[PDB]
């Protein structure tokens, strides 16, 4: 489901597919980093369900 899904964050159309994955975005070891999260959701949950 879209609850548990495994995505690719590299967005490289040059080397593709499945080799855009397996490569890492390497931040520097010298600095301690920080990330701002900004999410967007959509749902279709009914009132009464199992």
């Amino acid at each position: 489901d879209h609850s548990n899904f495994y995505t690719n964050i590299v967005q490289n159309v040059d080397v593709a597919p499945s080799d855009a994955a397996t490569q890492t975005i390497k931040l520097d070891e010298r600095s301690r980093w920080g990330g701002e999260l900004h999410t967007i959701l959509k749902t279709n949950a009914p009132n009464v369900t199992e």
Partner: protein, 51 residues
């Protein structure tokens, strides 16, 4: 530690490592070290006929 990748094959590298170390004629029952082999006269099948 274990960052395993889909491009890597963790299997079939142990198959080639073991063929480098020992032979594949011995049946070591701990690791279920038993070797797949066809019968040699069934694949090629000489047809020399009955005596």
């Amino acid at each position: 530690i274990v960052l395993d990748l889909n491009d890597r094959n963790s299997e079939l590298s142990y198959q080639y490592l073991l063929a480098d170390l020992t032979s594949r004629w011995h049946y070591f029952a701990l690791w279920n070290q038993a070797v797949d082999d066809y019968d040699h006269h069934v694949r090629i099948l000489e047809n020399d006929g009955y005596e």
